[PDB]
């Protein structure tokens, strides 16, 4: 490794935990993730449990908020990896997602380590939601397409602007555009790898354990730098 020292922590397996807390129209849930990445097969598994009971929001819509960092950033690209030259001190990453015909999800977590694990904790606020909407009337199908994710340099505050839209399928037919508005910038004083324009190539399977009685998403993703 020669681009960044952060780049080291990622060598192997590193354990994953995820902490989400949500507030959606009155209703608060906490979601749990536990699992680990391979940066060098971009891959991560992660099984989530709501951990107050029912999530009142679909699965799918939670996926992009519940750590860019376990991206495969191929050599010729290993200049561009923002997320991994925080390490270990991390970044905040913010968005604001837009449903379409719907609320918003306000999201704002620190991605860093804590000893030898990637934490992601996050808080995420749902404002001006349909009650009947695709969204608190649970009517996205249980899958989460392919996407791309643009990331831009942000020189002015030494970190990233991130855009991109995703599809959700509609139970019965139709789409729901979220779309994705991020910003990412370091904790840390270390250097960072501020990069040129690319894209993340984001393929996920999500499904559900057999033996698990709680609300909860079986997680398997494998992301890719592309320029």
Same mark, same amino acid.
């Given at each position: ?7 080291? +922590? ?6 994953? +935990? ?11 849930? @906490? ?5 680990? *990445? ?14 107050? *009971? ?16 376990? %991206? ?36 704002? *977590? ?29 009517k996205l199908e249980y899958n989460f397409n392919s996407h791309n994710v643009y990331i831009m340099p942000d020189k002015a505050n030494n970190g990233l602007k991130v855009n991109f839209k995703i599809r959700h399928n509609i139970e019965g037919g139709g789409v729901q555009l979220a779309d994705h ?23 996920? %399977?999500? @499904? ?16 890719? %730098?592309?320029?």
């Open positions: 490794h020669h681009h960044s020292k952060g780049e080291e +922590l990622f060598t192997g397996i590193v354990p994953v +935990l995820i902490e989400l807390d949500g507030d959606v129209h009155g209703h608060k849930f @906490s979601v749990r993730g536990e699992g680990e *990445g391979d940066a060098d097969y971009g891959k991560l598994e992660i099984k989530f449990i709501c951990t107050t *009971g029912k999530l009142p929001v679909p699965w799918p819509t939670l996926v992009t908020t519940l750590i860019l960092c376990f %991206a495969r950033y191929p050599e010729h690209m290993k200049m561009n990896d923002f997320f991994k030259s925080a390490m270990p001190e991390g970044y905040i990453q913010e968005r604001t997602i837009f449903f379409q015909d719907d609320g918003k999800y306000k999201t704002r *977590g620190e991605v860093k380590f804590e000893g030898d694990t990637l934490v992601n904790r996050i808080e995420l606020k749902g404002m001006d939601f349909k009650e009947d909407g695709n969204i608190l009337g649970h508005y991020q910003t990412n910038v370091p904790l840390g004083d270390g250097p960072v790898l501020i990069p040129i324009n690319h894209y993340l190539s984001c393929q996920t %399977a999500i @499904s559900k354990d057999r033996n698990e009685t709680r609300d909860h998403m079986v997680f398997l993703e494998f992301f890719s %730098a592309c320029g």
